Amino acid sequence: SEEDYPNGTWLGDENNPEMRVRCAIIPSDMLHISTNCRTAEKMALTLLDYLFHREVQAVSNLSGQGKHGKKQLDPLTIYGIRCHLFYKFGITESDWYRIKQSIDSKCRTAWRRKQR
DNA sequence: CTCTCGCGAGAG
DNA sequence: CTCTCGCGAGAG
């Protein structure tokens, strides 16, 4: 619902209420991202940085499972990335499976940075 | 920085 | 048991 982020933007197709998610990204920032992120792979990781602070990435993963006892990244927010990539690039479930590896791998990089 | 792959420990 | 999947870290 728009109200959760009054100065924010929609992830995915605003005219399609089942595949939209209100988010905290401001219009000027969402403009930068669409200008700069010309592939689903590059938009996914840039969305990640605008939706989650690096300090959340360094403690969090997609499942919230594993040996490091990591927090799970907000599932509604992750669904919102899925909705933006499907809308912006018409990616498939097989692409999204690949993208999710890459989000988790970025999150491990951040954990390893805090580590080192 | 991103992308990837072999590993092996718990989930099923 | 088999299967999934979180993981470290070398290579791009």
Author numbering: 209 to 324
Q: How is this structure described in the published paper?
A:
pmcThe BEN (BANP, E5R, and NAC1) domain is a ∼100-residue protein domain found in metazoans and viruses, but missing in nematodes and urochordates. There are nine BEN domain–containing transcription factors in the human genome, i.e., BANP, BEND2-7, and NAC1/2. The BEN domain-containing transcription factors regulate transcription by recruiting chromatin-modifying factors to specific chromatin regions via their DNA-binding BEN domains. Further structural analysis revealed that although all these BEN domains bind their target DNAs mainly through the insertion of the C-terminal α5 helix into the major groove of DNA, the residues of the α5 helices involved in the base interactions vary from one to another, explaining why they exhibit distinct DNA sequence preference.
We then synthesized a 12-mer DNA fragment with a palindromic sequence of CTCTCGCGAGAG for the crystallization study. We first measured its binding ability to the human BANP BEN domain by ITC, which showed that the BEN domain of BANP bound to the palindromic 12-mer DNA with a Kd of 8.4 μM. In the BANP-DNA complex structure, the extra C-terminal region after the helix α5 in the longer construct is disordered and unresolved in the structure. In the DNA-bound structure, the DNA binding surface of the BANP BEN domain was largely positively charged, which conferred electrostatic interactions with the DNA. The BANP BEN domain interacted with the palindromic DNA mainly through its C-terminal α5 helix, which inserted into the major groove of DNA. Specifically, the side chain of S313 from the α5 helix formed a hydrogen bond with the base of T4, and the side chain of R316 formed two hydrogen bonds with the base of G5′ that is the second G of the CGCG motif. S313 and T317 also formed two water-mediated hydrogen bonds with the base of C3. In addition to these base-engaged interactions, S310, D312, K314, R320, and Q323 from the α5 helix and N269, S271, Q273, and K278 from the loop connecting α3 and α4 (called Loop 1 thereafter) formed several hydrogen bonds or salt bridges with the backbone of DNA. The results showed that mutating N269, S313, R316, and R320 of BANP to alanine individually reduced its DNA binding affinity by ∼2-5-fold compared to the WT BANP. Taken together, our structural and biochemical data demonstrate that the BANP BEN domain mainly utilized the electrostatic interactions to bind DNA with some base-specific interactions with the TC motifs by the α5 helix and Loop 1 of BANP.
